[PDB]
Amino acid sequence: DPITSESEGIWNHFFVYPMSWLITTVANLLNGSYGLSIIIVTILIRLALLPLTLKQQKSMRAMQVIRPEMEAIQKKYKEKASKDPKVQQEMQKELLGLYQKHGVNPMAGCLPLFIQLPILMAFYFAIMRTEEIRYHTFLWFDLGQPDYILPFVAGITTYFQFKMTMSHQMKVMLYVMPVMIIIAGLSLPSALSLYWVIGNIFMIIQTYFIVVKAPPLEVLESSG
Ligand SMILES: [Cu+2]
Ligand SMILES: [Cu+2]
């Protein structure tokens, strides 16, 4: 009550207001087209996050490099009776030390989640607060009303997105998350699905044209 309303100002001024501003600005430039506005603004955000994404894909690919060391340390503890919290903690400590020495962050895998969630919520809030969108229609769907086709499209492109990024826990992201996206998409305004679809397509095209190269082992072992 005293400071929970103080966070309202932070959430509005720093997240919702700018997000809501981007949508309305582009839409008014394109003659009230909020459909094309959502598309362009989404691409704009994905463009600003492009260098950030590259740094993350580099970290993921760096983890693949030290996999022989991850395999070896696992073997050392595999033959021993594990599963117990005492032996499990020992493995975690030895595993973490491998990441530290080679300058690799295992938190890189769930890092995009920390960045997407605020943007997703900001987009959703900006859409709902903007009253002049619920009557706008794009293609075959209403921007303020749920759709029965778009959520399925969003689930396929989400699947394909993860499909390309995963080079030669894994099962959850590509087989559980896409169906969970579709379910959520059906119970949410079509604006989010469209927003999600474009987001996926951007990532798919990016991964196709821009491939991150794996850092040499020499680079990792020479970490400060
Ligand atoms: Cu208020
Ligand atoms: Cu204020």
Give me the DSSP letters along 147-162. -SSHHHHHHHHHHHHH
Q: What is the DSSP string of 63-130?
A: HHHTHHHHHHHHHHHHSS---SHHHHHHHHHHHHHHHHHTT--GGGGSHHHHHHHHHHHHHHHHHHH-
Nearest-5° angle of CA 189, CA 198, CA 30? 80
**44 CA to middle of ligand 2, Å?**
26
Instruction: Check residue 221 and give left, alpha or beta (phi > 0: left; psi -120 to 50: alpha).
Output: alpha
Q: What is the DSSP secondary structure assignment for residue 132, as one 8-state letter?
A: G
**13 CA to middle of ligand 2, Å?**
7
Structure tokens at 169: 């826990």
In sequence order, which residues have a C-beta less than 8 Å from that of residue 153 and are 6 or more positions away?
Answer: 193, 197
The technique by which this structure was obtained is: X-ray
**Share in percent of the chain as helix, strand, coil (round to 5):** 75, 0, 25
Nearest ligand (C-alpha, residue 10): 2
CA nearest to 80, candidates 90, 70, 69: 90
Three-state secondary-structure class, residue 155: helix
Structure tokens at 154: 């969003």
Nearest ligand (C-alpha, residue 5): 1
Cα separations in angstroms, 136 against 37, 69, 98, 199: 12, 55, 54, 21
**185 CA to middle of ligand 1, Å?**
28
Q: Which helix (H) or strand (E) holds 32?
A: none
**70 CA to middle of ligand 2, Å?**
51
Report the 10 Å Cβ neighbour count for 77.
Answer: 15
**Whole-angstrom distance, CA of residue 116 vs CA of residue 191:** 16
Three-state secondary-structure class, residue 138: strand
| Chain position carrying tokens 């005293």 | 2
**20 CA to middle of ligand 2, Å?**
15
Residue 137 — φ and ψ, nearest 5°? -120, 135
**9 CA to middle of ligand 1, Å?**
7
Three-state secondary-structure class, residue 8: helix
**43 CA to middle of ligand 2, Å?**
28
Torsion of CA 10, 123, 187, 178, to 10 degrees: -110
| Chain position carrying tokens 């499990």 | 88
Q: What is the DSSP secondary structure assignment for residue 215, as one 8-state letter?
A: P
Record the resolution, in angstroms: 3.2
In sequence order, which residues have a C-beta less than 8 Å from that of residue 34 and are 6 or more positions away?
Answer: 23, 27, 130, 132, 133, 136, 138, 143, 191
In sequence order, which residues have a C-beta less than 8 Å from that of residue 76 and are 6 or more positions away?
Answer: none
Q: 118 with 129: CB under 8 angstroms?
A: no
Burial of 1 (0-12, 13-18, 19+ CB in 10 A): exposed
| Chain position carrying tokens 């973490």 | 96
Query: How many domains is the chain partitioned into structurally?
Result: 1
Residue 141 — φ and ψ, nearest 5°? -130, 150
**122 CA to middle of ligand 1, Å?**
16
Structure tokens at 133: 């969108």
**195 CA to middle of ligand 2, Å?**
28
Nearest ligand (C-alpha, residue 129): 1
Torsion of CA 126, 129, 132, 133, to 10 degrees: 50
Structure tokens at 197: 């679809």
**128 CA to middle of ligand 2, Å?**
19
**14 CA to middle of ligand 2, Å?**
10
Domain residues for the domain of 156 are 1-224
